[PDB]
Amino acid sequence: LLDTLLGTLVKELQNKYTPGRREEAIAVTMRFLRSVARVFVILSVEMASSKKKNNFIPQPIGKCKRVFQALLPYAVEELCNVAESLIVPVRMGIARPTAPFTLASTSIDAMQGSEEL
Amino acid sequence: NASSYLTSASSLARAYSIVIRQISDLMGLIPKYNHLVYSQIPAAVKLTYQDAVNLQNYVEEKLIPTWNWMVSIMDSTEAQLRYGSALASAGDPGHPNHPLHASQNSARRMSARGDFLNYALSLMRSHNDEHSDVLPVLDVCSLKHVAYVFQALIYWIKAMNQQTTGQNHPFFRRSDSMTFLGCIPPNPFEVPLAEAIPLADQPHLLQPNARKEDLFGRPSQGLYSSSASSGKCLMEVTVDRNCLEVLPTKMSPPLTSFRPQCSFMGMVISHDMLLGRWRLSLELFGRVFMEDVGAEPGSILTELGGFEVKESKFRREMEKLRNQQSRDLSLEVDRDRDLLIQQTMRQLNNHFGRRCATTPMAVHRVKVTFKDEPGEGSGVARSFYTAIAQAFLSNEKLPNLECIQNDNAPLFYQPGKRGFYTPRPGKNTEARLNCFRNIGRILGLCLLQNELCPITLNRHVIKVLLGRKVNWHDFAFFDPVMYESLRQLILASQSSDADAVFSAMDLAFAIDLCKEEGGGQVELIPNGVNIPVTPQNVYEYVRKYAEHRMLVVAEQPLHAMRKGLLDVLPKNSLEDLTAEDFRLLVNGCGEVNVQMLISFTSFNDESGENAEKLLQFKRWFWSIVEKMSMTERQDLVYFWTSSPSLPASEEGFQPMPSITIRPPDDQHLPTANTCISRLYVPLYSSKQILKQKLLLAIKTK
Amino acid sequence: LLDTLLGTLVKELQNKYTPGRREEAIAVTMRFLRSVARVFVILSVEMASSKKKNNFIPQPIGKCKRVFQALLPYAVEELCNVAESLIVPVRMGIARPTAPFTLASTSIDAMQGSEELFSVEPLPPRPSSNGAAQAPRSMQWAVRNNASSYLTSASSLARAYSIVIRQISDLMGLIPKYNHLVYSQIPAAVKLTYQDAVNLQNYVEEKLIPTWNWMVSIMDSTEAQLRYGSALASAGD
């Protein structure tokens, strides 16, 4: 399913015959990559990068990485914007206080937290 | 729960680090995009060269503000730390305000208003550089988010850089274990050994919590305004955040050949120079932020980790490896030193028997037995290790080993400082070769068995055992006296009167080696006797003599010890280990520390007396230990845990040795159990009787 | 004593015949004004401005204000520098956590604390020749650990910045009536010209621009968030 979605996005991005189609494809890809970056960051934060077994990629994180690798030039730009958004409150001294939380050692716990979100 | 600002800041910084790591991976995927993504994944976006270049420009422009922020904070904090270190060097340790004082321990022990006033006054004094004779007020533990951001940006720089990628002799060049990344090494000849390599002068400086500056000398940096007007080639001196924020802001085609190059500051940036520039900050970060900021992939704090991370990883790997094989093997050992040597090598050869070659052998536990002496467990194994180490390390003749297949002088000698030993080769018979292989084998066994083998070795012996490359500075650990003589000769060769002095000394390419190695005159080079030593080739002569005195004399001993250690420990775990780490892991701490004993000590009771008497007895015992000498210290540690050396850290002692109090009695000596390393002490009613009984107990061997 | 010090500073500031005297006098005045700003800021932070009895002036605070008025064209610059020094960590998010403290309601209790902070000795020379506990011994002074919160430190530093900015504003508002209010009554005052006042205003605005941008950004953001919340409440279920 993800492969089909990315194929449609890429095919519409590389369109010259239909006028005014590249810009629409750019906007659609931008919004989709923003959503994928949001879910990727949420899942990555909810997890712990354990060195044991050298997994380093669960199934959802792998899907997000594949999406980023597909539309790479726009994925990196959206990632830059997301990172700057995350870091602006930290480097302006306006971060909202929160309570400590334990990082999930497995993936089912990460799914439950993400699903409530 | 806590609902603190710093937790949110650190979490957001971790999210930023995750995104920056993803950006770095994506950016590094471009040079192989047509092979790693386009060909494999069915849906991919065409990528040219110009769009990749514009993409890099976009990423750099977006990352500039956070880069400036992190540079400001890091420069300011490194300046504060360096000024604190300089003031500690130039200050009086007796004053309460000195950094190296107990009052600054931050754990043993003003008002909140006073603390804030100190912080504000420090900021105001530092703004215009008026911070002299007062230690800067900072809290590095509150800069976790800065640590995360620094880690992310250093990962980015390292990833892209890796995408890009006396006489000058590598023998004289300081090795990786010698120098610090990004800082040039001190000149081997200009600085005396007392300051260039303080570890050689005082071997007793090796401790689990040791700063590499004290052991291997203080490094300098080629920075500051001299031939440098870039912005980061100027060495950080100012403390206030305003100046170190103005400085980094006031300075203003096939796709497979991208070669991304990082110019954040208008100049090519190498991560090594950044690590050198923020050395103290990174040391503090690694020592403080390791549980959290040292866990993410590609952590520089992990790569630059000290002894703690390496020892924990090695011990965990050893536990994993020794538990992966169900083959349990043990030995039969008695006291009689000649019989001890014979039975030990025979049983070790039997341990080697029934297997031909190739894969190393792994054991689960060691169960040393004793004839006519009861006892079984880990304690008897530790006793065997200590006894065999002492027997192998006795300066007296050795029993014949003619039954190894069915060389008289002692194996190890002290070339320089007392307590450190290197092999002495004899006739190079197969018996001595097998004995050296056996000593390598039991050193390996003590490595896997988490037990302290006690054979103290010279540091280059440890290098040849671990497979590193010997530098001239390692020669400084051989013997300080004639090493200093060689350094003085090198210095004198630079003088204008070098030729006359060399002719007067009348040195040739031959070495007169005494009986500790075989004796006689050995030619460094063919026809070297007829070739005198000249200032033109003084570097070559010094190289040949220094390396010859310790490397070639014993090719066969060390080279056999190499397989002796390799036949038990696979080569995977010997990497990421230095000589100091191995010495602290096998030999433990050289001297027994009272504070180290206090760190892991628990007390029980069986007499049933009141708590006051038990507390008084514990205080008396601690006072005894404090007023009690080094040889008696090793005697007491032997009487306690059947070993004379404590392991490197708290973990490594199997039982966490404890002390129990027996019902009072003036005629019963204290006892101990090595299998659990528990010391039972009677509740002596008088001080002098307690001292006498304790000294009698520790005097037993 | 303060009058004599200010008189000598003014006399050496308005001396032209001696070569190189004015620059040295300017540097000395800058150093003295930095020290005065430090003591003034510490005293003000230690205190609480109670509206009761409308005192508005403790004895040392009035002395610092007299010093600032006497050397206003340089005192305002030194106060600007002090305010920037106090406000930079707050707006750069690096404030060192501190425990909350009460504010002195009397001038006889604010003297303590300031005494222990200012009346201190320098470090003597060497005779002859959380994971905080895991820090190296030589760096133990650089690591800490009733509350120890970042927000308390940020608020206190912002309070200090507010005090300094209020003093700066009062001094610059005194400029139009400098001759009638400051020059004639005070024995030791500095002559002020119109171009000097214009340069002073430009300097103050240029120094205050960064914190102004910081507050404008934060306040516009939070106001937009609150307005959106109100609109959604009006349009919500």
Curated annotation (Swiss-Prot), chain A:
The modification Phosphoserine is found at S85. It is found in: Nucleus; Cytoplasm. Widely expressed. Most abundant in testis and expressed at high levels in brain, pituitary and kidney. Coiled coil: none annotated. E3 ubiquitin-protein ligase involved in different protein quality control pathways in the cytoplasm and nucleus. Mainly acts as a ubiquitin chain elongator that extends pre-ubiquitinated substrates. Component of the N-end rule pathway: ubiquitinates proteins bearing specific N-terminal residues that are destabilizing according to the N-end rule, leading to their degradation. Recognizes type-1 N-degrons, containing positively charged amino acids (Arg, Lys and His). The UBR-type zinc finger forms a pocket that mediates recognition of type 1 N-degrons. The UBA domain recognizes and binds ubiquitin. It acts as an ubiquitin acceptor required to place 'Lys-48' of ubiquitin into the HECT domain activie site, thereby potentiating the E3 ubiquitin-protein ligase activity. Belongs to the UBR5 family. Homotetramer; composed of a dimer of dimers. Associates with CDK9 and TFIIS/TCEA1 and forms a transcription regulatory complex made of CDK9, RNAP II, UBR5 and TFIIS/TCEA1 that can stimulate target gene transcription (e.g. gamma fibrinogen/FGG) by recruiting their promoters. Associates with the E3 ligase complex containing DYRK2, EDD/UBR5, DDB1 and DCAF1 proteins (EDVP complex). Binds TOPBP1. Interacts with PIH1D1. Interacts with CIB1. This is E3 ubiquitin-protein ligase UBR5. It comes from Homo sapiens. The lineage of its organism: Eukaryota, Metazoa, Chordata, Craniata, Vertebrata. The chain holds residues 1397 to 1513 of 2799 of the full protein.
Curated annotation (Swiss-Prot), chain B:
One of its GO terms (cellular component) is cytoplasm. Keywords: Acetylation, Cytoplasm, DNA damage, DNA repair, Host-virus interaction, Metal-binding, Nucleus, Phosphoprotein, Transferase, Ubl conjugation pathway, Zinc, Zinc-finger. Its main location: nucleus. The modification Phosphothreonine is found at T179, T302. Widely expressed. Most abundant in testis and expressed at high levels in brain, pituitary and kidney. Changing E130R: Impaired tetramerization. The keyword Nucleus applies. It comes from the Eukaryota. Transmembrane segments: none annotated. The modification Phosphoserine is found at S8, S175, S177, S225, S330, S378. GO terms for molecular function: RNA binding; ubiquitin binding; ubiquitin protein ligase activity; ubiquitin-ubiquitin ligase activity; zinc ion binding. GO terms for biological process: cytoplasm protein quality control; cytoplasm protein quality control by the ubiquitin-proteasome system; DNA damage response; DNA repair; DNA repair-dependent chromatin remodeling; heterochromatin boundary formation; negative regulation of smoothened signaling pathway; nuclear protein quality control by the ubiquitin-proteasome system. It is found in: Nucleus; Cytoplasm. The active site is at C675 (glycyl thioester intermediate). Residues 407-701 form the HECT domain. The keyword Zinc-finger applies. Residues 87-109 are annotated as: Disordered. Belongs to the UBR5 family. The UBR-type zinc finger forms a pocket that mediates recognition of type 1 N-degrons. E3 ubiquitin-protein ligase involved in different protein quality control pathways in the cytoplasm and nucleus. Mainly acts as a ubiquitin chain elongator that extends pre-ubiquitinated substrates. Component of the N-end rule pathway: ubiquitinates proteins bearing specific N-terminal residues that are destabilizing according to the N-end rule, leading to their degradation. Recognizes type-1 N-degrons, containing positively charged amino acids (Arg, Lys and His). Homotetramer; composed of a dimer of dimers. Associates with CDK9 and TFIIS/TCEA1 and forms a transcription regulatory complex made of CDK9, RNAP II, UBR5 and TFIIS/TCEA1 that can stimulate target gene transcription (e.g. gamma fibrinogen/FGG) by recruiting their promoters. Associates with the E3 ligase complex containing DYRK2, EDD/UBR5, DDB1 and DCAF1 proteins (EDVP complex). Binds TOPBP1. Interacts with PIH1D1. Interacts with CIB1. (Microbial infection) Interacts with human T-cell leukemia virus 1/HTLV-1 protein HBZ; this interaction modulates HBZ stability. This is E3 ubiquitin-protein ligase UBR5. It comes from Homo sapiens.
